[PDB]
Design a protein around this ligand. Structure first.
Ligand code: BDP
Ligand code: BDP
Lengths: 572, 576
């Protein structure tokens, strides 16, 4: 990559300044902004919070449902002391695609709405003055970028997003924005990989910098004491009596990467990491050489009013709820999340399956290029989190064809080359993939709705029989790999009670889950269960979605339905 | 004040760095933190978002309901270039009271949970190094600080807050936190006041600095063009063809205050202001010499999970809802809000009644008065230069029928008048016990605000026809007093459970909310001196648990998520 994915920090060498707050904002239905000079300032803006999705602020349909080009602007004072630094704008994300301008000059463009965008403004920045940033954003969906969909044009020219996926097309500047300053020679990337040797551990590393000066790498324990030190852009740190990062029992070391010259340090990057190994062995998922059974949820970045807007408060509430259920895992369905989710998982000892936005899939070569780019960016961003134990490279694509296999072979090969740890890779399969892609997977993830979309309600005993039929077929294949159910659930309206239960009632959600557990527990090779979904979340409106998706175990406001205690008791 | 209330800005002379994020946090039930070195770092912290209220993150009762001492900590890197500046920690608020430590040193303490706390760390700050801030906070309620209440001790030593007010005792670091650097001689305060002269306007000003060097004051229009310039710490800016700040049609100039040192500048402060006048004339409220009728709501700082935690997203949604109802006003019931609420009201042309947290007051009175006056001074000093702020509310439903009460509020109002350069209208909200011929305090008020619940707490439901008669009987009594002042209803409403429908209506149904409002409007419109209506409440909000509160207060016209009940349209159509 032509930029660093490293999370920004502040020290003697690196500065950061938050651009979060109220930005200027303007819709551009006629696509006239660039030919009207909007990159020099918006002519009739309204105010827009950053970070946030723009949609749910407005009180009118057309602004909520806006699809097309729209623009952000803000101004910021740059300290004079940032002169002679490399100065970058860093967006947590820009959803879905955009072009970044600074002081009227085009800096960079990015396609993909759920990973950082870095814009080098070194040559146009004005230290000791007010500076301007303007972003042209587009939120249309197509079949050559992720996540896939279409754009419908109403007769009057108005655009409407048509997702091929079951979540609302939130967009805008949904994550934090910084302006940062780096030394002229800086740490650009690093990778760690772990080996356990009795009570000791090895931390294998590589460092990439923007120069040729020597690198020193130090490892500090949780109290800031030096436990290992070596020299070179590649090396091994030896840790005596290592304190391993364990499930729901984290321990974090701090890696410190220094660039030096003859007169001292040029750059210092530091980050918390956790010493842990992940391996698949037969039908077992091994964490630090011991089997672990995954227990948890698919989530979303979704909250009232803010949409997918990042807030630490949502992180905190959601993790308190996760711990209360006795969960140990979540999947970032269906896109990489804000970096802070992973930082916090590291602290709390949660396991993450990190998922690229490969949802709604079927121009194929262009789509593959986008898919691989998102994969590279995700892995480069997230590889050094101890919480990230697996990559999910798709959710319910087509998989019953020869070509599809060639496509995913390239995606998996790309993931392998970018992950220094070569950790387990997978993807979630829909039922259409009836018992050549699953061999690419290190473990198999199944999304199943036996008892909801298949033989629901009065037919639930038939659903159980059908479910067992399918699992008996998988069993007979004797693949000797772990199976994880990455989705299962029922739409459930809080307060809808019925005796006997009906589809959509709280009681049915409980009975459905009990049935699924009976099936899961009947097969040795099942090694995880992630319920769909942690919480009710927004979707496109329609005849099958009653104010979004209600398969949450929690409400959107993060309160438990009856079924929540079912998970709590089972996972205890 | 021993510090500046001015909102922090960043330029060549002033620096700022946000401390918002995940802080360290620890409860201190045994009150041993200061005995055990916690001011140098918490021994077993958990993570806590800032800004936010702490209560609603947890999944257990005892942490949610925690009452007593609790601590926050974070670390930050201070740029070497800040050396020998005046360096301050600035908390949007610390709820309710607290002591700020920096690098192990006690810096300042503050009582009052809804206004900025400034801590001067100039002598202990470590430029070019990592620094530590630790805050000891307490959220107990008592009768010598605002808002008033009690603290109950359960059998086992556990404390429980017992408010004398109808909102949940949210607390913590609920607003943004900054570390800032100021020049050694700086602009500490300024005040503006306006006079309209035909098509022109005068901006009268005063500037307070921490030194004796010359001051220059400039006014820029919305395009940044210079329209006026004057010299001195006191003066008048003459604005030709002034573009007035109008209700729901804002225009903002930028005031620029410079301290100069002959061949250079020592400090610069800039802030957006709006040229507007507000007066009471007979029974009318005049904005820029024209009558305005107030239309809107009492609000709260309240939102799912975040509690009172500040977020621009809540501001944006709430103002879009306000505009959709055709409102022009809200009251900051029952405490000053985060500064950003006023900044945005300035931009959107909304009128604000700014309210000090004087609720629950019904030998400790002398201390209470001191606290009340202090909060009043801080509120007015912080908020006076917002064009949106057109009135101060100095109480909500205290005792008012005794002579002691009159003497108490005389001193509060006198303090408020001393601190407001504009001498804009001062008021307070009266509950019904302050009967027309019993009340002693209304003469202090520039206009009178009434909270009334005829049709809810009095003769509700089947008796609503009686409620209306009782309401007219009281207003007839006020009318006969011929006070020649405007009356504003600052509260009226019914608890309403979204989705509860009944024909015929019942108390708590959406239909009854509509009928109650219609009855109230008929009464309002029968009296010429009524000059405003602020409904209680904009949105459902959290309260203490109890048999009278079904997951908080449901008198919202909007749900807590910010979606309209049936009655929202009633307001929209009437206020159009
Ligand atoms: O229909 C559903 O609830 C779900 O169906 C699954 O196939 C998708 O993976 C998921 O994102 C949907 O929300
Ligand atoms: O009972 C109520 O709903 C309200 O009563 C009024 O007296 C209070 O001023 C207000 O804060 C309460 O919420």
């Amino acid at each position: 990559l032509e930029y660093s994915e490293l999370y920004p920090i502040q020290n003697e060498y690196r500065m950061m300044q938050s651009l979060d707050g109220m930005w200027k904002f303007q819709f551009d239905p006629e696509e006239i902004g660039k030919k009207s000079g909007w990159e020099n300032g918006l002519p009739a803006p309204v105010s827009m919070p950053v970070p946030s999705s723009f949609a749910d602020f407005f009180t009118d349909h057309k602004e909520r449902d806006y699809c097309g080009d729209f623009w952000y602007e803000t101004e910021f004072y740059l300290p004079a002391e940032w002169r002679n630094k490399k100065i970058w704008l860093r967006f947590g994300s820009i959803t879905h695609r955009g072009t970044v301008y600074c002081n009227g000059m085009e800096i960079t463009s990015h396609e993909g709405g759920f990973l950082p965008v870095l814009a080098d403004i070194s040559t146009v920045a004005k230290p000791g003055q007010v500076n301007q940033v303007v972003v042209k954003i587009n939120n249309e969906l197509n079949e050559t970028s992720l996540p896939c969909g279409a754009t419908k044009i109403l007769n009057n020219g108005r655009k409407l997003a048509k997702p091929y996926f079951d979540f609302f097309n939130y967009s805008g500047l949904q994550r934090s924005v910084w302006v940062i300053a780096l030394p002229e020679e800086s740490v650009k990337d690093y990778s760690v990989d772990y080996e356990l040797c009795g009570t000791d551990a090895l931390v294998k590393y590589e460092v990439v910098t923007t120069g040729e000066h020597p690198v020193i790498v130090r490892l500090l324990d949780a109290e800031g004491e030096l436990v290992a030190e070596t020299e070179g852009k590649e090396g091994i740190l030896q840790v005596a009596n290592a304190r391993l990062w364990e499930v729901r029992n984290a321990y974090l070391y701090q890696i410190v990467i220094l660039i030096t010259d003859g007169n001292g340090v040029l750059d210092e990057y530091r980050e918390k990491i956790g010493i842990r190994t992940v391996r698949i062995e037969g039908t077992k998922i091994l964490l630090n050489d011991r089997p672990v059974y995954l227990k948890g949820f698919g989530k979303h970045e979704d909250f009232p009013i803010l949409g997918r807007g990042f807030h630490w408060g949502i992180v905190k509430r959601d993790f308190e709820c996760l711990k209360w259920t006795n969960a140990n895992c979540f999947r970032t369905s269906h896109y990489p999340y804000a970096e802070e989710w992973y930082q916090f998982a590291d602290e709390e000892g949660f396991l993450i399956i990190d998922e690229v936005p490969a949802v709604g899939m079927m121009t194929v070569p262009e789509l593959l290029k986008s898919h691989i780019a998102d994969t590279e960016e995700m892995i480069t961003r997230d590889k050094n989190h101890p919480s990230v134990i697996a990559w999910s490279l798709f959710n319910e694509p087509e998989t019953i064809t020869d070509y599809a296999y060639e496509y995913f072979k390239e995606v998996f090969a790309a993931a392998e080359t970018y992950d220094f740890q070569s950790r387990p890779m997978t993807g979630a399969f829909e039922k259409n993939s009836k018992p050549k892609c699953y061999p690419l997977c290190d473990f198999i993830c199944l999304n199943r709705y036996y008892g909801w979309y298949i033989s629901g309600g009065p037919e639930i005993e038939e659903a159980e029989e059908l479910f067992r039929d399918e699992m008996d077929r998988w069993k007979a294949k004797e693949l000797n790999v772990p199976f994880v159910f990455t989705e299962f659930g029922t739409d459930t309206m809080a307060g809808l009670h019925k005796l006997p239960s009906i589809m959509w009632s709280e009681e049915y959600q409980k009975e459905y889950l009990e049935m699924n557990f009976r099936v899961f527990d009947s097969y040795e090779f099942v090694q995880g269960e992630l319920a769909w979904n942690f919480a009710d979340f927004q979707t496109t409106e329609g005849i099958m979605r009653v104010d979004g998706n209600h398969k949450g175990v929690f409400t959107r406001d993060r309160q438990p339905k009856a079924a929540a205690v079912v998970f709590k008791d089972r996972w205890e």
